[PDB]
Scaffold this active site. Structure first.
Site, mmCIF file in Angstrom:
data_model
loop_
_atom_site.group_PDB
_atom_site.id
_atom_site.type_symbol
_atom_site.label_atom_id
_atom_site.label_comp_id
_atom_site.label_asym_id
_atom_site.label_seq_id
_atom_site.Cartn_x
_atom_site.Cartn_y
_atom_site.Cartn_z
ATOM 1 N N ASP A 42 27.388 49.161 1.619
ATOM 2 C CA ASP A 42 26.964 48.037 2.469
ATOM 3 C C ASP A 42 28.217 47.419 3.143
ATOM 4 O O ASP A 42 29.308 48.010 3.097
ATOM 5 C CB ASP A 42 26.069 47.027 1.716
ATOM 6 C CG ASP A 42 26.803 46.231 0.669
ATOM 7 O OD1 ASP A 42 28.008 46.455 0.464
ATOM 8 O OD2 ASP A 42 26.161 45.355 0.032
ATOM 9 N N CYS A 59 29.738 48.798 -3.051
ATOM 10 C CA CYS A 59 29.294 47.488 -2.545
ATOM 11 C C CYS A 59 30.244 46.426 -3.085
ATOM 12 O O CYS A 59 31.363 46.764 -3.501
ATOM 13 C CB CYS A 59 27.798 47.229 -2.832
ATOM 14 S SG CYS A 59 27.294 47.021 -4.554
ATOM 15 N N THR A 111 30.256 44.774 -5.801
ATOM 16 C CA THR A 111 30.549 45.003 -7.229
ATOM 17 C C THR A 111 30.330 46.449 -7.638
ATOM 18 O O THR A 111 30.716 46.853 -8.734
ATOM 19 C CB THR A 111 29.633 44.185 -8.146
ATOM 20 O OG1 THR A 111 28.263 44.512 -7.840
ATOM 21 C CG2 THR A 111 29.868 42.667 -7.981
ATOM 22 N N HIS A 113 31.147 63.034 -20.116
ATOM 23 C CA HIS A 113 29.988 62.800 -20.977
ATOM 24 C C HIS A 113 28.677 62.713 -20.187
ATOM 25 O O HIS A 113 27.665 63.235 -20.617
ATOM 26 C CB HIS A 113 30.176 61.545 -21.852
ATOM 27 C CG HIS A 113 31.255 61.689 -22.886
ATOM 28 N ND1 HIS A 113 31.480 60.751 -23.871
ATOM 29 C CD2 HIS A 113 32.148 62.688 -23.105
ATOM 30 C CE1 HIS A 113 32.474 61.157 -24.644
ATOM 31 N NE2 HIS A 113 32.897 62.329 -24.201
ATOM 32 N N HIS A 147 26.472 66.431 -24.950
ATOM 33 C CA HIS A 147 26.404 65.641 -23.712
ATOM 34 C C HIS A 147 25.337 66.195 -22.760
ATOM 35 O O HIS A 147 24.651 65.419 -22.105
ATOM 36 C CB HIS A 147 27.768 65.543 -23.032
ATOM 37 C CG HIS A 147 28.874 65.155 -23.967
ATOM 38 N ND1 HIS A 147 28.911 63.932 -24.608
ATOM 39 C CD2 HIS A 147 29.964 65.841 -24.399
ATOM 40 C CE1 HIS A 147 29.974 63.878 -25.392
ATOM 41 N NE2 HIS A 147 30.636 65.022 -25.279
#
Lengths: 148, 148
Positions: free
Chosen positions: A8, A65, A67, A98, A133
């Site tokens: 964004d 973005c 965060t 993982h 995994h």
């Protein structure tokens, strides 16, 4: 290896830097936008990158973005997508080792430029470790099948 | 509010501390396991907490694994769930304010105890800001409807 990238307005400037970084390293980069600072909606660009990785148009993707949280949640709604919001290289390495993450999510307002490049470098080089995994990734697939 | 909490073996000791923290604070805590250090699979416990929050059995959830990445990706596969992996209180606050996160994800191998409690404190207190953030959460809902 083809890397899809998207953001964004909150991740647009970091996206520009990462796109340059990647091209300089000889990656093919598909930029899904956004293409400016105008306010836009992170799910739209999360979806574009996720669907490109799902279809095999891109091998993996990077979403940004403010965060990394919103765009990675949106991307993780797509079946077959495992988007990892990383704030250090340790997390970036474990997401590949993982979780076999196929999308890296970053927060332009959280990590500074050189740190973010460190994280990208680490993520691109790390290798899935399989074994238990893979079994756990299959169980993620089972959740997808349940709500499909 | 009722808080659902869950982890694999990688987040079990931190889960124990957070459960104690919350109860001392007056929260009703529902512990979905795991209940020891034995190796287990993060999607199983991510799913339990996510489904409890979705059903309204818990108002909000906290999920923990080594990094928080696997368990939060798993939780995010459930429609109506918005799980936020946070490594600082700034992220925790934005996850509530912008993403209306209903699950907090933590990495026991990444954040130390007091930092993790600071993040939990911040997350529990922060408030969704609505407006364009609701519009964007709706767009997350649209991705879910597409792949449902």
């Amino acid at each position: 290896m083809k890397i899809g990238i998207g953001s964004d307005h909150g991740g647009y400037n970091l996206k520009r830097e990462i796109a340059d970084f990647l091209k300089k390293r000889g990656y093919e980069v598909i930029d899904f936008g956004t293409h400016g600072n105008e306010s836009v909606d992170y799910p739209d660009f999360g979806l574009k990158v996720a669907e490109a990785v799902k279809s095999g148009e891109c091998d993996r993707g990077i979403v940004i973005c403010g965060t990394g949280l919103g765009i990675s949640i949106a991307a993780n709604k797509v079946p077959g997508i495992r988007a990892a919001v990383c704030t250090n290289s340790y997390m970036a390495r474990m997401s590949r080792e993982h979780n076999d993450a196929n999308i890296l999510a970053l927060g332009e307002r959280v990590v500074g430029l050189d740190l973010a490049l460190d994280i990208v470098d680490t993520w691109l080089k790390a290798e899935f470790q399989g074994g238990r995994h893979a079994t756990r990734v299959g169980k993620i697939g089972e959740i997808e099948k349940k709500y499909s």
